[PDB]
């Protein structure tokens, strides 16, 4: 295994949280975005005309993605194509963290570059609740 991520803002949920890095550098600061559509990242975001590319001078985008329906590596690949700088997969149930693994089936696996991590449903819901309230959610990854 378990690593760390730091929600730097807002104050309501800021702090250090456990996470499990995907089984597939330096410090990285980004801003969290929960997409309106395609929340499980099983289809291409360009089908929805959704991009996570950051405008010049602004924080890179960490996309929050729900667990389910497709492989974790496809989620990371689809988010990477949409321009995300990292992917956080919120677990679909409240349980201990698991290590996202390669599909084994039975590339693009050698072409996945963005950092990947699975977080708890509790932290996933807390992040979504802060974004729904109108606050930006910033985060620091030191892996």
């Amino acid at each position: 295994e378990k690593n760390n991520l730091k929600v730097t803002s807002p104050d309501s949920i800021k702090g250090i949280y456990e996470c499990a890095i995907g089984n597939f550098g330096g410090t990285l600061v980004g801003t969290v975005v929960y997409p309106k559509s395609n929340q499980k990242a099983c289809k291409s975001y360009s089908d929805f005309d959704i991009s996570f590319k950051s405008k010049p001078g602004r924080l890179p985008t960490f996309v929050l993605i729900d667990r389910g329906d497709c492989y974790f590596t496809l989620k990371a690949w689809i988010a990477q194509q949409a321009g995300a700088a990292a992917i956080l997969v919120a677990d679909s149930k409240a349980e201990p963290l698991i290590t996202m693994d390669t599909p084994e089936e039975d590339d693009y696996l050698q072409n996945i570059t963005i950092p990947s991590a699975l977080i708890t449903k509790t932290l996933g819901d807390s992040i979504k609740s802060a974004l729904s309230g109108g606050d930006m959610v910033n985060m620091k990854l030191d892996w």
């Binding site: 089984n23 667990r67 389910g68 329906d69 497709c70 492989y71 974790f72 590596t73 201990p96 963290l97 698991i98 290590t99 996202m100 693994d101 390669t102 599909p103 084994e104």
Partner: peptide
């Protein structure tokens, strides 16, 4: 605990 999906 390890899983692919």
């Amino acid at each position: 605990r390890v899983a692919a999906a």
